[PDB]
Design a protein around this ligand. Sequence first.
Ligand SMILES: CC(C)[C@H](N)C(=O)O
Length: 344
Amino acid sequence: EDIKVAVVGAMSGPVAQYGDQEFTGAEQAVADINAKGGIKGNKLQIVKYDDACDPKQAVAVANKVVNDGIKYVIGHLCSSSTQPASDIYEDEGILMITPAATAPELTARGYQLILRTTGLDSDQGPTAAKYILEKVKPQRIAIVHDKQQYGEGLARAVQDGLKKGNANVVFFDGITAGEKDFSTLVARLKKENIDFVYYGGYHPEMGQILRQARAAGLKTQFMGPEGVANVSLSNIAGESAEGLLVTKPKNYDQVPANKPIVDAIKAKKQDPSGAFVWTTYAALQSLQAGLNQSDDPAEIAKYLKANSVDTVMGPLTWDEKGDLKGFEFGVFDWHANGTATDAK
Ligand SMILES: CC(C)[C@H](N)C(=O)O
């Protein structure tokens, strides 16, 4: 008697790379759980939904999931699309574990049926600021964001921390996502002789900004959130992605204990290096731990906040809001290689 689990993320669109990572992680974890017998004999069955990381299409997905009788949702990914979906799931008694949404607002609303297998930007932001103040110490900072929930929230958090350190923030600018042309911004960085730029947003925009900055002879150092730390950034920017600083989950694919999963994934020619392969795999293991105790959303949610669950990410424990206790983002150097190393 299969147990339906909706996996929802961007499978198409501008940031389909987030979904490629999520589905790869969900697929392998379900393959592993089922291989050992699943949940007390019952196998997990993945039902795939594409919300294109679009708020309107995510609601349409939420309504279909509620309608299809599915009780557990592993997703969505982007915060502004997860928000509206989340509310429909909460009002409807459907558990929702998100492996990528980081805006604080998600777990700040009293929801009793939401959990994350990733951290909060209330931590990610501060970490970038601290690192800039203590290790980079630039002289002329500019901050750019895409006017979206995730990017602006992070951009304002970083501005905040830099001010507390009395750093020199020359300007705070918001750009429109989807635009491929940034000559104006670039010409401005050159003009203001900006030596450091924190960018709050996704890889599509970061990739264009980076290419256009190097093409104009700028050596400006850039830094972005985990949202820009992925192979699609390197695809778009080419060598211009080299040198980029990023905050992002720890390299779980490097944990020696995890090598069997890395191998199984590589054997299907899929990419196991993305952070979301692991948070999603972890989300599936949390749901497994839950389904072993009960099939009822509230019961599962209760049980998770009550226990420490061992996962590919290490032991996980959640607060009453459904956030990971003690989660920490590291700062890394990103390489055109699709590789990432500990930052100085
Ligand atoms: C990268 C993406 C999933 C981002 N963390 C967000 O909350 O939108």
